[PDB]
Amino acid sequence: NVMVEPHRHEGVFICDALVTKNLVPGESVYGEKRVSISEGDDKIEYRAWNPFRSKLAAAILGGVDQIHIKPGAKVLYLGAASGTTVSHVSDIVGPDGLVYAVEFSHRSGRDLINLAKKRTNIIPVIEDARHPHKYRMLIAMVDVIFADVAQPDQTRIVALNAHTFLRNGGHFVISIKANCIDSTASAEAVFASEVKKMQQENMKPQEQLTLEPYERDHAVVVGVYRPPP
Ligand SMILES: Nc1cc(C(F)(F)F)ncn1
């Protein structure tokens, strides 16, 4: 009997509870349940991934086609907060991947620094994502940008970071809380407006979904970056 199965997304697993392979066996990050499966001399531990805390987990359970975050990927994570979702991104990309965790809160930044002490593949970047010139010398070209900055101007922020750091043909995954962009607009109006702006920066959406029942009026947009020569 096989208890934990590879999910369709590489690096993600099931048992429906979503889990990731714990990069730091023995440690929880935010109180999450851990499941360790021993067989002979083999041993593997997984970490439960809460979709009521993590928009990426909510999107995966909601049936997103691609997340692009995968083993070996280099990920620029804008709005890393205290590292809840970042820790699972770190699990997914694994030892040969990289996660830049950009977060401008010094309080949350201390959580990220503690998280990255154990996880060699996390680089904490305690900076304002509006001013990538301040940290551009730290960030190697990445495969994916994940953005959860929850600002009216977050599309322009993500675009600015994409133009600096994202490889041609790399991908983006953007979390959009509608009332953080414009609380006097309908969710549909916000999402249409942000998708339109993305297209104008050669950030081409390939799918979009909302996150019910985990969140209200919250979208994830996944797409591909195809900038001009
Ligand atoms: N949580 C955040 C937000 C930002 C922002 F707003 F400046 F883009 N930069 C970094 N972390």
Q: Please note each residue after which the chain is broken, C-to-N distance over 2.5 A, or write none.
A: 15
Short-list 58, 54, 41, CA closest to 90: 54
> What is the set of domains in the chain, with CATH numbers?
5-48 (3.30.200.20), 55-225 (3.40.50.150)
What's the gap in Å between 136 CA and the centre of ligand 1? 15
As a whole number of Å, the end-to-end CA separation of the chain is 52
**Binding residue positions for S-adenosyl-L-methionine:** 84-85, 103-104, 128-129, 148-151
Resolution (A): 1.8
Q: Which class for 118: exposed (0-12), middle (13-18), buried (19 or more C-beta within 10 A)?
A: middle
Residue 75: φ, ψ to 5°: -125, 125
Residues facing residue 125 across a β-bridge: 102
Element (H, E) at 217: none
Method: X-ray
Binding-site members are: 84-85, 103-104, 128-129, 148-151
Query: What is the C-alpha to C-alpha distance for residues 119 and 190, in angstroms, rounded to an integer?
Result: 36
Which atom of ligand 1 is found nearest the CA of 131?
7
Contact of 158 with 147, CB cutoff 8 Å: yes
Indicate the angle between helix axes 84-93 and 106-118, nearest 10 degrees: 30
For residue 213, count other CB atoms closer than 10 A to its CB: 10
Q: By alpha-carbon position, which residue is closest to atom 8 of ligand 1?
A: 129
CA-148 nearest atom, ligand 1? 1
Structure tokens at 100: 């830049």
Q: What residues line ligand 1, using a CB cutoff of 6 Å?
A: 79, 102-104, 128-130, 149, 151, 157
Tell me how far apart the alpha carbons of residues 102 and 88 are, in angstroms, rounded to a whole number.
Answer: 15
Q: Which helix (H) or strand (E) holds 97?
A: none
Q: Are 216 and 225 in contact (CB under 8 A)?
A: no
Residue 80 near residue 113 (C-beta atoms within 8 A):
no
* Distance separating alpha carbons of residues 170 and 68, to the nearest angstrom: 9
Ligand 1 atom 2: the closest Cα is on which residue? 79
157 is written with which tokens? 């922020």
Residue with tokens 């101007």: 153
Q: Which amino acid is at 137?
A: M
